[PDB]
Coordinates of C-alpha atoms and ligand atoms in Angstrom, one line a residue:
Chain A
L1 CA -58.0 -61.3 7.4
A2 CA -60.2 -58.2 7.3
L3 CA -61.9 -59.7 4.3
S4 CA -63.8 -62.3 6.4
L5 CA -66.0 -59.5 7.7
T6 CA -69.7 -59.6 6.9
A7 CA -71.5 -56.7 5.2
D8 CA -73.1 -55.8 8.5
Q9 CA -69.7 -55.9 10.3
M10 CA -68.1 -53.9 7.4
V11 CA -70.6 -51.1 7.7
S12 CA -70.4 -51.1 11.5
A13 CA -66.6 -50.9 11.6
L14 CA -66.6 -47.9 9.2
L15 CA -69.3 -46.1 11.1
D16 CA -67.3 -46.4 14.3
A17 CA -64.2 -45.3 12.5
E18 CA -65.7 -41.9 11.6
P19 CA -63.5 -38.9 12.5
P20 CA -64.8 -36.0 14.6
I21 CA -66.0 -32.7 13.3
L22 CA -63.5 -29.9 14.0
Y23 CA -63.9 -26.2 14.7
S24 CA -62.0 -23.3 13.1
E25 CA -59.3 -21.6 15.2
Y26 CA -61.1 -18.3 15.1
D27 CA -61.6 -16.0 18.1
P28 CA -65.4 -15.5 17.6
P31 CA -63.8 -9.9 14.5
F32 CA -64.0 -11.4 11.0
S36 CA -57.7 -14.3 6.2
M37 CA -60.1 -16.9 4.9
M38 CA -57.6 -19.1 3.2
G39 CA -55.6 -19.1 6.5
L40 CA -58.6 -20.5 8.4
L41 CA -59.3 -23.1 5.7
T42 CA -55.6 -24.2 5.6
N43 CA -55.5 -24.5 9.4
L44 CA -58.7 -26.6 9.3
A45 CA -57.5 -28.8 6.5
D46 CA -54.2 -29.5 8.2
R47 CA -55.9 -30.5 11.4
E48 CA -58.5 -32.6 9.6
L49 CA -55.6 -34.4 7.8
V50 CA -54.4 -36.0 11.1
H51 CA -57.8 -37.5 11.9
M52 CA -58.1 -38.8 8.3
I53 CA -54.9 -40.8 8.8
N54 CA -56.3 -42.4 11.9
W55 CA -59.6 -43.1 10.1
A56 CA -57.8 -44.7 7.2
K57 CA -56.0 -47.1 9.6
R58 CA -59.5 -48.3 10.7
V59 CA -60.6 -49.0 7.1
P60 CA -60.7 -52.9 6.8
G61 CA -57.8 -54.2 4.8
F62 CA -55.9 -50.9 4.7
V63 CA -53.2 -51.6 7.3
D64 CA -52.6 -54.9 5.6
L65 CA -50.7 -53.0 3.0
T66 CA -47.1 -51.9 3.4
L67 CA -46.5 -48.5 5.0
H68 CA -45.1 -47.4 1.7
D69 CA -48.3 -48.3 -0.1
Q70 CA -50.4 -46.8 2.7
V71 CA -48.7 -43.4 2.3
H72 CA -49.1 -43.5 -1.5
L73 CA -52.8 -44.0 -1.3
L74 CA -53.2 -41.2 1.2
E75 CA -51.0 -39.0 -1.0
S76 CA -53.4 -39.6 -3.9
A77 CA -56.7 -39.4 -2.0
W78 CA -56.2 -36.9 0.8
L79 CA -57.9 -33.9 -1.0
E80 CA -60.7 -36.1 -2.4
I81 CA -61.4 -37.3 1.1
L82 CA -61.5 -33.8 2.5
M83 CA -63.9 -32.7 -0.2
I84 CA -66.4 -35.5 0.1
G85 CA -66.3 -35.0 3.9
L86 CA -67.0 -31.3 3.5
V87 CA -69.9 -32.0 1.0
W88 CA -71.4 -34.6 3.4
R89 CA -71.7 -32.3 6.4
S90 CA -72.9 -29.5 4.0
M91 CA -75.8 -31.6 2.7
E92 CA -78.4 -30.2 5.1
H93 CA -77.3 -26.6 4.4
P94 CA -78.4 -25.6 0.9
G95 CA -76.1 -23.0 -0.9
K96 CA -73.5 -23.1 1.9
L97 CA -70.4 -25.0 2.7
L98 CA -70.0 -26.1 6.3
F99 CA -66.2 -26.1 6.6
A100 CA -66.9 -26.1 10.4
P101 CA -69.9 -25.5 12.7
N102 CA -68.5 -22.1 13.3
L103 CA -67.4 -21.5 9.7
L104 CA -70.4 -21.9 7.3
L105 CA -69.8 -20.0 4.1
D106 CA -71.8 -19.2 0.9
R107 CA -70.4 -18.7 -2.6
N108 CA -70.4 -14.9 -2.1
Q109 CA -67.8 -15.2 0.7
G110 CA -65.9 -17.6 -1.7
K111 CA -65.2 -14.5 -3.9
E114 CA -59.9 -15.5 -5.8
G115 CA -60.5 -18.4 -8.2
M116 CA -62.3 -20.1 -5.4
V117 CA -65.9 -19.5 -6.4
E118 CA -65.5 -21.9 -9.3
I119 CA -64.6 -24.7 -6.9
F120 CA -67.2 -23.5 -4.3
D121 CA -69.8 -24.0 -6.9
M122 CA -68.6 -27.5 -7.8
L123 CA -68.7 -28.5 -4.1
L124 CA -72.2 -26.9 -3.7
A125 CA -73.4 -28.8 -6.7
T126 CA -72.1 -32.1 -5.3
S127 CA -73.8 -31.4 -1.9
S128 CA -77.1 -30.8 -3.8
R129 CA -76.7 -34.1 -5.6
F130 CA -76.1 -35.8 -2.3
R131 CA -79.3 -34.0 -1.2
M132 CA -81.3 -35.0 -4.3
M133 CA -80.2 -38.7 -3.9
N134 CA -80.9 -38.7 -0.2
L135 CA -77.4 -40.1 0.5
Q136 CA -77.3 -42.2 3.6
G137 CA -74.5 -42.2 6.2
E138 CA -73.9 -45.9 5.6
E139 CA -73.4 -45.2 1.9
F140 CA -71.2 -42.2 2.6
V141 CA -68.6 -44.1 4.6
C142 CA -68.4 -46.8 1.9
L143 CA -67.8 -44.1 -0.8
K144 CA -65.1 -42.5 1.3
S145 CA -63.4 -45.8 1.8
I146 CA -63.5 -46.5 -2.0
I147 CA -61.7 -43.2 -2.7
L148 CA -58.9 -44.1 -0.3
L149 CA -58.2 -47.4 -1.9
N150 CA -58.9 -46.5 -5.6
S151 CA -57.3 -43.1 -6.1
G152 CA -53.7 -44.3 -6.0
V153 CA -54.2 -47.8 -7.5
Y154 CA -52.7 -46.7 -10.9
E165 CA -50.1 -59.1 -4.3
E166 CA -50.6 -55.5 -3.1
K167 CA -52.8 -54.3 -6.0
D168 CA -54.8 -57.6 -5.9
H169 CA -55.5 -57.1 -2.2
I170 CA -56.8 -53.6 -2.8
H171 CA -59.2 -54.9 -5.5
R172 CA -60.5 -57.6 -3.1
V173 CA -61.2 -54.9 -0.5
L174 CA -62.8 -52.7 -3.1
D175 CA -65.0 -55.7 -4.1
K176 CA -66.0 -56.2 -0.5
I177 CA -67.2 -52.6 -0.2
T178 CA -69.2 -53.1 -3.4
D179 CA -70.9 -56.1 -1.9
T180 CA -71.6 -54.0 1.2
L181 CA -73.2 -51.1 -0.8
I182 CA -75.5 -53.6 -2.6
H183 CA -76.3 -55.2 0.8
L184 CA -77.2 -51.8 2.2
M185 CA -79.4 -51.0 -0.7
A186 CA -81.1 -54.4 -0.6
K187 CA -81.7 -53.8 3.1
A188 CA -83.2 -50.4 2.2
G189 CA -85.8 -52.3 0.2
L190 CA -84.6 -51.3 -3.3
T191 CA -85.2 -53.7 -6.2
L192 CA -82.2 -55.4 -8.0
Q193 CA -82.5 -53.0 -10.9
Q194 CA -82.6 -50.0 -8.5
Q195 CA -79.6 -51.4 -6.7
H196 CA -77.2 -51.5 -9.6
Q197 CA -78.6 -48.2 -10.9
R198 CA -77.9 -46.5 -7.6
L199 CA -74.5 -48.1 -7.3
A200 CA -73.6 -46.6 -10.7
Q201 CA -75.0 -43.2 -9.7
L202 CA -72.8 -43.1 -6.6
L203 CA -69.7 -44.3 -8.3
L204 CA -70.2 -41.8 -11.1
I205 CA -70.2 -39.1 -8.4
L206 CA -66.7 -40.1 -7.4
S207 CA -65.5 -39.2 -10.9
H208 CA -66.8 -35.7 -10.3
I209 CA -65.1 -35.6 -6.9
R210 CA -61.8 -36.6 -8.6
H211 CA -62.4 -33.8 -11.0
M212 CA -62.9 -31.3 -8.2
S213 CA -59.7 -32.5 -6.5
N214 CA -57.8 -32.0 -9.7
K215 CA -59.2 -28.4 -10.2
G216 CA -58.7 -27.8 -6.5
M217 CA -55.1 -28.9 -6.7
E218 CA -54.6 -26.5 -9.6
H219 CA -56.2 -23.6 -7.6
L220 CA -54.2 -24.4 -4.5
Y221 CA -50.9 -24.4 -6.4
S222 CA -51.8 -21.1 -8.1
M223 CA -51.8 -19.5 -4.7
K224 CA -48.0 -20.0 -4.5
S225 CA -48.1 -21.1 -0.8
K226 CA -45.1 -22.8 0.8
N227 CA -46.6 -26.3 0.0
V228 CA -49.8 -27.9 -1.0
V229 CA -49.4 -31.7 -0.7
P230 CA -48.5 -33.5 2.6
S231 CA -45.0 -34.8 2.4
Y232 CA -44.2 -38.6 2.5
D233 CA -42.6 -38.2 5.9
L234 CA -45.5 -36.3 7.3
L235 CA -48.0 -38.9 6.3
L236 CA -45.7 -41.7 7.5
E237 CA -45.2 -39.9 10.9
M238 CA -49.0 -39.5 11.3
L239 CA -49.4 -43.2 10.5
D240 CA -47.3 -44.0 13.6
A241 CA -45.6 -47.2 12.6
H242 CA -44.9 -49.8 15.2
Chain B
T6 CA -83.9 -52.4 -24.6
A7 CA -80.4 -53.3 -23.3
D8 CA -79.9 -55.3 -26.5
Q9 CA -81.0 -52.4 -28.7
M10 CA -78.8 -50.1 -26.7
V11 CA -75.7 -52.2 -27.3
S12 CA -76.4 -52.5 -31.0
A13 CA -77.0 -48.8 -31.5
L14 CA -73.7 -48.0 -29.8
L15 CA -71.7 -50.6 -31.7
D16 CA -73.0 -49.3 -35.0
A17 CA -72.2 -45.7 -33.9
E18 CA -68.5 -46.6 -33.5
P19 CA -66.2 -44.2 -35.3
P20 CA -63.5 -45.6 -37.7
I21 CA -59.8 -46.0 -36.8
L22 CA -57.8 -43.2 -38.5
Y23 CA -54.3 -43.3 -39.9
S24 CA -51.3 -41.1 -39.6
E25 CA -49.9 -39.8 -42.9
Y26 CA -47.7 -42.1 -45.0
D27 CA -44.2 -41.4 -46.5
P28 CA -41.6 -44.1 -47.1
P31 CA -38.6 -41.7 -41.3
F32 CA -40.4 -40.8 -38.1
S33 CA -38.9 -38.0 -36.0
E34 CA -39.5 -37.0 -32.4
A35 CA -39.7 -33.4 -33.5
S36 CA -42.8 -34.0 -35.7
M37 CA -44.5 -36.2 -33.1
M38 CA -46.7 -33.6 -31.4
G39 CA -47.7 -32.4 -34.9
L40 CA -48.9 -35.9 -35.9
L41 CA -50.8 -36.4 -32.7
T42 CA -52.5 -33.0 -33.0
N43 CA -53.4 -33.8 -36.6
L44 CA -54.8 -37.1 -35.5
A45 CA -56.7 -35.7 -32.5
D46 CA -58.3 -33.0 -34.7
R47 CA -59.5 -35.5 -37.2
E48 CA -61.0 -37.8 -34.6
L49 CA -62.9 -34.9 -33.1
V50 CA -65.0 -34.6 -36.3
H51 CA -66.0 -38.3 -36.1
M52 CA -66.6 -38.0 -32.3
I53 CA -69.3 -35.3 -32.9
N54 CA -71.0 -37.6 -35.4
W55 CA -70.7 -40.5 -33.0
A56 CA -72.2 -38.5 -30.1
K57 CA -75.3 -37.7 -32.2
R58 CA -75.9 -41.4 -32.6
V59 CA -75.7 -42.0 -28.9
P60 CA -79.3 -42.7 -27.8
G61 CA -80.9 -39.7 -25.9
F62 CA -78.1 -37.3 -26.8
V63 CA -79.8 -35.4 -29.7
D64 CA -82.8 -35.1 -27.4
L65 CA -80.8 -32.4 -25.6
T66 CA -80.6 -28.8 -26.6
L67 CA -77.7 -27.9 -28.9
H68 CA -76.3 -25.7 -26.1
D69 CA -76.2 -28.6 -23.7
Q70 CA -74.9 -31.0 -26.3
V71 CA -72.0 -28.5 -26.9
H72 CA -71.6 -28.3 -23.1
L73 CA -71.2 -32.1 -22.7
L74 CA -68.6 -32.3 -25.5
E75 CA -66.6 -29.4 -24.0
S76 CA -66.4 -31.4 -20.8
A77 CA -65.8 -34.9 -22.2
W78 CA -63.9 -34.5 -25.5
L79 CA -60.5 -35.3 -24.2
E80 CA -61.7 -38.1 -21.9
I81 CA -63.4 -39.7 -25.0
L82 CA -60.2 -39.3 -27.1
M83 CA -58.2 -41.0 -24.3
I84 CA -60.4 -43.9 -23.6
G85 CA -60.6 -44.5 -27.4
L86 CA -56.8 -44.5 -27.5
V87 CA -56.6 -46.9 -24.5
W88 CA -59.0 -49.3 -26.1
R89 CA -57.2 -49.7 -29.4
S90 CA -53.9 -49.9 -27.5
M91 CA -55.2 -52.7 -25.3
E92 CA -53.8 -55.6 -27.3
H93 CA -50.4 -53.9 -27.5
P94 CA -48.5 -54.0 -24.2
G95 CA -46.2 -51.1 -23.5
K96 CA -47.3 -49.2 -26.5
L97 CA -49.9 -46.6 -27.4
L98 CA -51.6 -47.2 -30.7
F99 CA -52.4 -43.6 -31.7
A100 CA -52.8 -45.0 -35.2
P101 CA -52.0 -48.4 -36.9
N102 CA -49.0 -46.7 -38.4
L103 CA -48.2 -44.6 -35.3
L104 CA -47.4 -46.9 -32.4
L105 CA -45.4 -45.2 -29.7
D106 CA -43.6 -46.2 -26.5
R107 CA -42.9 -44.2 -23.3
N108 CA -39.3 -43.7 -24.5
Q109 CA -40.5 -41.7 -27.5
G110 CA -42.7 -39.8 -25.1
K111 CA -39.6 -38.5 -23.3
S112 CA -38.9 -36.3 -26.4
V113 CA -41.8 -34.1 -25.4
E114 CA -41.4 -32.4 -22.0
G115 CA -44.1 -33.7 -19.6
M116 CA -45.4 -36.4 -21.9
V117 CA -44.1 -39.5 -20.3
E118 CA -46.2 -38.9 -17.2
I119 CA -49.4 -38.9 -19.2
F120 CA -48.1 -41.7 -21.4
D121 CA -47.6 -43.8 -18.3
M122 CA -51.2 -43.1 -17.1
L123 CA -52.6 -44.1 -20.5
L124 CA -50.4 -47.2 -20.6
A125 CA -51.5 -48.1 -17.0
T126 CA -55.1 -47.8 -18.2
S127 CA -54.5 -50.1 -21.1
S128 CA -53.0 -52.6 -18.8
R129 CA -56.1 -52.4 -16.6
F130 CA -58.4 -53.0 -19.6
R131 CA -56.2 -56.0 -20.4
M132 CA -56.3 -57.4 -16.9
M133 CA -60.1 -57.0 -16.8
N134 CA -60.5 -58.5 -20.2
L135 CA -62.6 -55.5 -21.3
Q136 CA -65.1 -56.3 -24.0
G137 CA -66.1 -54.1 -26.9
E138 CA -69.7 -54.0 -25.8
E139 CA -68.5 -52.8 -22.4
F140 CA -66.2 -50.2 -24.0
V141 CA -69.0 -48.4 -26.0
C142 CA -71.1 -48.4 -22.9
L143 CA -68.3 -46.7 -20.9
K144 CA -67.6 -44.1 -23.6
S145 CA -71.3 -43.1 -23.8
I146 CA -71.4 -42.8 -20.0
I147 CA -68.5 -40.4 -20.2
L148 CA -70.2 -38.2 -22.8
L149 CA -73.4 -37.9 -20.7
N150 CA -71.9 -37.8 -17.2
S151 CA -68.7 -35.7 -17.4
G152 CA -70.4 -32.4 -17.8
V153 CA -73.7 -33.1 -16.1
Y154 CA -72.3 -31.6 -12.9
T155 CA -71.4 -28.3 -14.3
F156 CA -74.5 -27.0 -16.1
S159 CA -80.9 -23.3 -12.7
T160 CA -83.4 -23.0 -15.6
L161 CA -86.5 -25.2 -15.8
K162 CA -85.2 -26.5 -19.1
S163 CA -81.9 -27.6 -17.5
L164 CA -83.9 -29.5 -14.9
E165 CA -85.6 -31.4 -17.6
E166 CA -82.3 -32.0 -19.3
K167 CA -80.5 -33.4 -16.3
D168 CA -83.4 -35.8 -15.5
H169 CA -83.3 -37.0 -19.0
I170 CA -79.5 -37.6 -18.9
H171 CA -79.9 -39.6 -15.6
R172 CA -82.6 -41.8 -17.2
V173 CA -80.3 -42.5 -20.2
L174 CA -77.4 -43.2 -17.8
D175 CA -79.6 -45.6 -15.8
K176 CA -80.5 -47.4 -19.0
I177 CA -76.8 -47.8 -19.9
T178 CA -76.2 -49.2 -16.5
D179 CA -79.0 -51.7 -17.1
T180 CA -77.3 -52.6 -20.4
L181 CA -74.0 -53.2 -18.7
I182 CA -75.7 -55.5 -16.2
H183 CA -77.5 -57.2 -19.1
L184 CA -74.2 -57.8 -20.9
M185 CA -72.4 -59.2 -17.8
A186 CA -75.4 -61.5 -16.9
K187 CA -75.4 -62.7 -20.5
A188 CA -71.6 -63.3 -20.1
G189 CA -72.5 -65.8 -17.4
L190 CA -71.5 -63.7 -14.4
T191 CA -73.2 -64.3 -11.0
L192 CA -75.2 -61.4 -9.4
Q193 CA -72.3 -60.7 -7.1
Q194 CA -69.8 -60.8 -10.0
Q195 CA -72.1 -58.5 -12.0
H196 CA -72.1 -55.8 -9.3
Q197 CA -68.4 -56.1 -8.7
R198 CA -67.4 -55.7 -12.4
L199 CA -69.8 -52.8 -12.8
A200 CA -68.1 -51.0 -9.9
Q201 CA -64.7 -52.0 -11.3
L202 CA -65.6 -50.5 -14.7
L203 CA -67.1 -47.3 -13.4
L204 CA -64.1 -46.6 -11.1
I205 CA -61.9 -46.7 -14.2
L206 CA -63.8 -43.6 -15.3
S207 CA -62.5 -41.7 -12.2
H208 CA -59.0 -42.4 -13.5
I209 CA -59.9 -41.3 -17.0
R210 CA -61.2 -38.1 -15.7
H211 CA -57.9 -37.7 -13.8
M212 CA -55.9 -38.2 -17.0
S213 CA -58.0 -35.7 -18.9
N214 CA -57.4 -33.0 -16.3
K215 CA -53.6 -33.7 -16.2
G216 CA -53.6 -34.0 -20.0
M217 CA -55.4 -30.6 -20.3
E218 CA -52.8 -29.1 -18.0
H219 CA -50.0 -30.5 -20.1
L220 CA -51.6 -29.3 -23.4
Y221 CA -52.0 -25.8 -22.1
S222 CA -48.3 -25.7 -21.0
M223 CA -47.3 -26.2 -24.6
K224 CA -48.4 -22.6 -25.4
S225 CA -50.0 -23.6 -28.7
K226 CA -52.7 -21.3 -30.3
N227 CA -55.4 -23.3 -28.6
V228 CA -56.1 -26.6 -26.7
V229 CA -59.9 -27.0 -26.4
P230 CA -62.4 -27.0 -29.2
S231 CA -64.3 -23.7 -29.2
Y232 CA -68.0 -23.4 -28.4
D233 CA -68.6 -22.2 -32.0
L234 CA -66.6 -25.0 -33.4
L235 CA -68.5 -27.7 -31.5
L236 CA -71.7 -26.0 -32.2
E237 CA -70.9 -25.7 -35.9
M238 CA -70.1 -29.4 -36.1
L239 CA -73.1 -30.2 -33.9
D240 CA -75.5 -27.7 -35.5
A241 CA -76.0 -29.5 -38.7
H242 CA -78.5 -28.2 -41.2
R243 CA -81.2 -29.9 -43.3
Ligands
85M301 C1 -62.2 -28.3 0.1 C2 -61.7 -27.4 1.1 C3 -61.6 -27.8 2.5 C4 -62.2 -29.1 3.0 C5 -62.1 -29.4 4.3 C6 -61.4 -28.6 5.2 O1 -61.2 -29.0 6.5 C7 -60.7 -27.4 4.8 C8 -60.9 -27.1 3.5 O2 -60.3 -25.9 3.0 C9 -59.7 -25.9 1.7 C10 -58.2 -26.3 1.7 C11 -57.2 -25.3 2.0 C12 -55.9 -25.6 2.0 C13 -55.4 -26.9 1.8 O3 -54.1 -27.3 1.8 C14 -53.2 -26.7 2.7 C15 -52.0 -27.6 2.9 N1 -52.2 -28.6 3.5 C16 -52.8 -29.5 2.9 C17 -52.4 -30.7 3.7 C18 -51.0 -30.5 3.9 C19 -50.8 -29.2 3.8 C20 -56.4 -27.9 1.5 C21 -57.7 -27.6 1.5 C22 -60.4 -26.8 0.7 C23 -60.2 -26.3 -0.7 C24 -59.7 -27.1 -1.6 C25 -59.4 -26.7 -2.9 C26 -59.6 -25.4 -3.2 O4 -59.4 -25.0 -4.5 C27 -60.1 -24.5 -2.3 C28 -60.4 -24.9 -1.0
85M302 C1 -54.5 -38.6 -25.6 C2 -53.7 -38.2 -26.8 C3 -54.4 -38.5 -28.1 C4 -55.6 -39.3 -28.2 C5 -56.2 -39.5 -29.4 C6 -55.6 -39.0 -30.6 O1 -56.2 -39.2 -31.8 C7 -54.5 -38.2 -30.5 C8 -53.9 -38.0 -29.2 O2 -52.7 -37.1 -29.2 C9 -52.7 -36.2 -28.1 C10 -53.3 -34.9 -28.4 C11 -52.6 -33.9 -29.1 C12 -53.2 -32.6 -29.3 C13 -54.5 -32.3 -28.9 O3 -55.1 -31.1 -29.1 C14 -54.9 -30.4 -30.3 C15 -56.1 -29.3 -30.3 N1 -57.0 -29.7 -30.8 C16 -57.9 -30.6 -29.8 C17 -59.0 -30.6 -30.4 C18 -59.2 -29.3 -30.9 C19 -57.8 -28.7 -31.0 C20 -55.2 -33.3 -28.2 C21 -54.6 -34.5 -27.9 C22 -53.2 -36.7 -26.8 C23 -52.4 -36.2 -25.6 C24 -53.2 -35.5 -24.7 C25 -52.7 -34.9 -23.6 C26 -51.4 -34.9 -23.4 O4 -50.9 -34.3 -22.3 C27 -50.5 -35.6 -24.3 C28 -51.1 -36.2 -25.4

């Protein structure tokens, strides 16, 4: 029934659903990966609660909800990082008390640092709006793991598309500018998927205990009724 | 114009190549046939790219850069396209049509086979048109490596690529409008089509991982090779 929402209501619901910005657990004597892992793990929880507030998401089975999160969790983290890093050229704001440049990024991380920084710059160049950001983040959640259930996801995706066009029309853009900007934003998501892939490779190469959140962890965080 | 754009892309389409003929197939020679096929389609791909409007306007260095980034994606989407009318099978060639069971012979291949098969199914579900296909393939060429290029020349390059990309978007909208779609249906299908590219990028990455794991002499076409094919003389 979350499809009956209007473009205005869709945008409003997403804006309110935005997760908070977290701080790194560092006693402000400067171990970097440890800080990032701790932050990522804590930001995962809020992501799950955010996802539940994305219109149409909880209409899916818990099984399908977990699958989507399994596919999209790193992508969602990255675009979130890029977003809050927009107003800080050449630096990645992992947290308000943890803003790093590519020099600090220097084993195998600098390559991914540069990709993230380039995406942030692109956001900057395009003057990405908050209303557009929440739409793009929602698209990632629903689309990343899509390869009655599948049809519902596409209907939700279509609704977000209508909303993006609505926002751009509201911003005064012409019709040609609207479909052009829509394409530009969606093409950015392909790059974000690319970063997530390379990021996964890099994280696995670190030989940590685990990289991906388990099915049970995601399920538990969802908090079924 | 959008119409001129579509025509140029259609005419630029590379031919469908065949696997060698000898009157049986064996799972041991499978990777060999695919490698042979892939290498031969690479040559035609370079010639295709040169005929993509705006591509040859770029420096040879940046042309090579784009192909390095997109070459596997382009191979995959081409494979998915000609496999579209063949449910449950991948038409690598008219005389080389494989199922996922044959994929099991090569360690790690079924996973990538399934992703390709899923993409073919999506094309089928969406009733993807040939005009739309060539648009998507050109977009891959120009966009895939545009995010991994500070020189003043590079700034000119990226802006040019974005202008070409914008034109292809206009062409897609033109095609769908011509197809009778409403404005809302146009924006929805455009998004649907562009989101598929995210999956294709995903397959290319996983495919690259798989190819490297095979410990062959090389996986990616070298800069000098791409340059050599791209750096034609007069
Ligand atoms: C993008 C970066 C990021 C974004 C937001 C954030 O709050 C923290 C952050 O730090 C990096 C990161 C570090 C570790 C990590 O995985 C640790 C394992 N957890 C992942 C969730 C379950 C278990 C995931 C991401 C992470 C990263 C990802 C890939 C990479 O190659 C380097 C750093
Ligand atoms: C997508 C598949 C494909 C597409 C079109 C085609 O004509 C052949 C084809 O077979 C698979 C393939 C096999 C080998 C290959 O690389 C051989 C190295 N050359 C690549 C270009 C220069 C060197 C690249 C792709 C290839 C594939 C790719 C990744 C993978 O994990 C499994 C099969």
